[PDB]
Design a protein around this ligand. Structure first.
Ligand SMILES: Nc1nc2c(c(=O)[nH]1)N[C@H]1C(S)=C(S)[C@@H](COP(=O)(O)OP(=O)(O)OC[C@H]3O[C@@H](n4cnc5c(=O)[nH]c(N)nc54)[C@H](O)[C@@H]3O)O[C@H]1N2
Ligand SMILES: Nc1nc2c(c(=O)[nH]1)N[C@H]1C(S)=C(S)[C@@H](COP(=O)(O)OP(=O)(O)OC[C@H]3O[C@@H](n4cnc5c(=O)[nH]c(N)nc54)[C@H](O)[C@@H]3O)O[C@H]1N2
Ligand SMILES: [Cl-]
Ligand SMILES: [Mo]
Ligand SMILES: [O]
Length: 763
């Protein structure tokens, strides 16, 4: 009777992996979760997939004329298998050429993506570490998650807000009468964390449901969360939450339910905003009736939400889909303004939180220590990252950004390691053109993703299961140190990214700076010991690394009474004169003079409603439906798309698209039919999921399906359809969820999806 389980971890949690005769045969949670997490069950598929990159590969046409090839052959050339020595020499020589001719401002290595958890084997960080050791690189600003909110919140609250600990969930359970999931789908989106999910956020949502208190979901779709918690669904048109919030706010004023004392003491600029709210400026009071016409919520329901939010202790939980769209800055600005008018900020169970849906925000912070991690350190060229296509195509172009002007650099080489821009970036067909501009495109990948398929040189990377690492239970509780013990040796000819970059560093003469003379296990011990020392200072005994590593189990910490009772903005509420915010006024900036003075047409000095170019309110005869692109339940973006989880959602071997029965009937579409979706940007195939769980006039296609072009995507990659434009001049965030489309039934034999097979090689 043998213990055949190795414990490791992923973004989707601590994983127990059963190994039989050197082969992985089962994976699942190392710690029982409140809700099953099927993402944990496919380690074997990840290890043994025929979609894996097996050996270093170079495009035929690039091998023939390196750095001087016909780059329009990217994505459609034959691949040549080469040795590691040949591939690494070629990467080094091609990057050296760019460094010699253009310098670091000719190399883009922002390399946005989620890769895998782990303190050491962080592929993106290891790439940037190599780039810095060899002279530097052009990176980026912001991220795709909160590109808008993370720029406006510093102006409004003096802090980034979206990536900070929330009021304790124990306070919510005890004191909140209502939680409002506004653009938030936590039973989907907390199946993962940036480190490794602690699995407790979903447990807390379940406890809140079981207490019988009110859960309200405001969303164009009746999401997995709304269904699984049997919450009250408020259907809303995508991109019309600001009108809805204005109508609620106007009702508060009309019924004397706003907190005038709070607004005077804790905010700046409320009176100027109220003039807009009441129509004194523009002739149009922002009534519940005015709002109902735009957002699709009946006026009497808007008024009843306002009364209930003010009558009960209410937590407004704002998710991020609604700021991933044109004018996205306005949504969380207005949510904070609404919370200010309700006046419950800083009270137990009250106010707002912008990370209750992300990585277990609000789970009480444990007392212990936090492990270290590798860094990129052994720019005027940096740009808001969703301008990447624009940058690659248009060197020298200038844009406005948060009160400054940015000049695009002139990029000759692109290196990606740990992200999938040909799935994650908007307007895929335009990104194809952008990727024809560089002299050389290099990708480290586990699998033959759409991005790998667009490269010149593809280097096979290992999964987490083929190496040793450490992570934490996260992202806020920090309640455990999770070992990531190697399960099997590297498969095929794959290498850890760390080893790839060690070989490149050696060719550049900087190996010693890159490795600091440490082995894998010496790095891990250094990272662990940071937690050990911090825990000791907190009076928490930990095993030393050798004992922890041998035990190969999560090491757990406990939360104390202070963390269980912690209320965000409690100190500000107690005394705002001595605990002011880091803003110009020391208060919540409902009107921001700093933003006003930027004089941007698409972001004013207070939250406001500005119609976007494409949304439910300006659909056309040609494109009569609106689109939303939520995050998927059975993938982390594009990760795990190639595994057996596909069978849990594919419809007729395509990505499912949610379609309301009346929109489907008007087109002769029945549940299960293949359909063609198209926009001005492109077209995709999808499988119809006909359901009343999407608001009429809108369709939902989850992001992350692998682009499989014929241009027409055979598989259903949502970003083939979306617009590539900045949210506004304030943040220049990405704007996928303001989009209009047409759908028609696909007639005849449908094409086979080929993007999970090995690519075309030479004969
Ligand atoms: N329409 C629309 N578009 C969106 C979104 C949306 O809501 N709607 N969401 C946006 C957001 S919030 C994000 S975060 C992005 C996500 O975009 P990405 O982060 O690019 O998506 P992932 O699928 O997680 O890509 C991670 C890649 O890293 C690889 N990888 C994993 N581990 C390793 C490793 O150790 N080494 C190497 N070399 N590779 C590894 C995986 O094989 C995988 O291809 O998508 C964004 N795009
Ligand atoms: N299982 C899983 N979990 C994940 C991810 C994943 O890919 N898979 N991605 C992770 C990442 S990188 C992030 S950034 C977060 C993303 O966290 P979010 O940004 O919050 O996730 P989304 O699914 O984009 O949006 C949540 C809800 O908002 C809705 N919504 C979209 N637009 C609007 C709007 O205009 N108004 C309203 N009222 N609702 C709208 C969506 O329909 C959706 O149900 O999740 C993380 N967690
Ligand atoms: Cl109280
Ligand atoms: Mo994200
Ligand atoms: O992200």
């Amino acid at each position: 009777a043998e213990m055949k389980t190795v414990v490791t971890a992923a973004h989707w949690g601590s994983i127990g992996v059963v190994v039989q005769d050197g082969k992985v045969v089962k994976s699942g949670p190392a710690i029982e979760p409140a809700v099953p997490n099927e993402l944990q069950t496919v380690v074997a598929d990840q290890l043994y997939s025929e979609a894996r990159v097996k050996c270093p590969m170079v495009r035929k046409g690039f091998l023939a004329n390196p750095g001087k090839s016909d780059t329009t052959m990217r994505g459609r050339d034959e691949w040549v298998r080469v040795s590691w020595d040949e591939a690494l020499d070629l990467v080094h020589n091609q990057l050296k050429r760019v460094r010699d001719e253009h310098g670091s401002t000719g190399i883009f290595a922002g390399s946005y993506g989620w890769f895998s958890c782990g303190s050491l084997h962080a592929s993106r960080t290891l790439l940037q570490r190599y780039m810095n050791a060899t002279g530097g690189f052009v990176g980026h600003k912001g991220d795709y998650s909160t590109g808008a909110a993370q720029v406006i919140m510093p102006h409004v609250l003096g802090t980034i807000e979206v990536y900070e600990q929330q009021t304790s969930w124990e306070s919510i359970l005890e004191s909140s009468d209502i939680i409002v999931l506004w653009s938030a789908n936590p039973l989907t989106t907390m199946r993962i964390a940036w480190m490794s999910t602690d699995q407790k956020g979903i447990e807390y949502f379940k406890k809140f449901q079981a207490s019988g208190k009110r859960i309200i979901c405001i969303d164009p779709q009746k999401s997995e969360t709304c269904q699984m918690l049997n919450a009250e669904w408020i259907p809303v048109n995508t991109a019309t939450d600001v009108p809805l919030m204005l109508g609620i706010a106007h009702t508060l004023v009309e019924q004397g339910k706003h907190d005038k004392d709070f607004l005077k003491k804790y905010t700046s600029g409320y009176a100027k905003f109220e003039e807009y709210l009441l129509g004194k400026t523009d002739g149009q009071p922002k009534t519940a009736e005015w709002a109902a016409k735009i957002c699709g919520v009946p006026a009497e329901t808007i008024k009843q939400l306002a009364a209930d939010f003010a009558s009960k202790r209410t937590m407004l939980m704002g998710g991020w889909g609604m700021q991933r769209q044109r004018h996205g800055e306005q949504t969380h600005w207005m949510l904070v303004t609404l919370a200010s008018m309700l006046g419950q900020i800083g009270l137990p169970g009250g106010g707002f939180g912008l990370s209750y849906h992300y990585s277990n925000g609000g789970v009480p912070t444990a007392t212990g220590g936090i492990i270290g991690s590798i860094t990129a350190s052994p720019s005027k060229s940096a740009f808001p990252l969703a301008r990447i296509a624009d940058v690659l195509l248009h060197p020298g172009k200038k844009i406005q950004y948060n009160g400054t002007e940015i000049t695009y650099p002139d990029i000759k080489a692109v290196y990606w390691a740990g992200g999938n821009p040909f799935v994650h970036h908007q307007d895929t067909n335009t990104l194809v053109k952008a990727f024809q501009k560089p002299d050389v495109v290099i990708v480290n990948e586990v699998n033959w993703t759409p991005t790998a398929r667009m490269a010149d040189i593809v280097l096979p990377a290992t999964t987490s299961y083929e190496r040793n690492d450490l992570t934490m239970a996260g992202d806020y509780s920090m309640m455990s140190v999770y070992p990531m013990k190697q399960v099997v040796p590297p498969q095929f000819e794959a290498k850890n990214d760390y080893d790839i970059f060690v070989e490149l560093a050696k060719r550049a003469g900087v190996e010693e700076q890159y490795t600091e003379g440490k082995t894998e296990m010496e790095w891990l011990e250094e990272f662990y010991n940071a937690a050990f020392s911090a825990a000791r200072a907190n009076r928490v005994a930990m095993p030393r690394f050798d004992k922890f590593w041998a035990e190969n189990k999560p090491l757990s910490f406990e939360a104390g009474e202070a963390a269980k009772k912690w209320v965000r903005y409690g100190e500000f509420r107690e005394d705002p004169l001595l605990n002011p915010l880091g803003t110009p006024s020391g208060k919540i900036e409902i009107f921001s003079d700093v933003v006003e003075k930027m004089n941007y047409n698409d972001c004013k000095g207070h939250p406001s409603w500005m119609e976007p170019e494409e949304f439910a309110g300006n659909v056309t005869e040609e494109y009569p439906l609106a689109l939303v692109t939520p995050h998927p339940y059975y993938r982390l973006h594009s990760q795990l798309a190639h595994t057996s989880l596909r069978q849990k959602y594919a419809v007729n071997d395509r990505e499912p698209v949610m379609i309301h029965p009346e929109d489907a009937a008007a087109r002769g579409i029945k549940d299960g039919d293949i359909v063609r979706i198209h926009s001005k940007r492109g077209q995709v195939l999808a499988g119809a999921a006909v359901t009343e769980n999407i608001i009429k006039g809108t369709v939902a296609l989850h992001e992350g399906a692998w682009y499989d072009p014929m241009p027409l995507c055979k598989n259903g990659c949502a970003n083939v359809l979306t617009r590539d434009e900045g949210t506004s001049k304030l943040a220049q965030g990405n704007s996928p969820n303001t989009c209009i489309v047409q759908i028609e039934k696909f007639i005849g034999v449908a094409p086979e999806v080929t993007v999970f097979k090995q690519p075309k090689q030479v004969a």
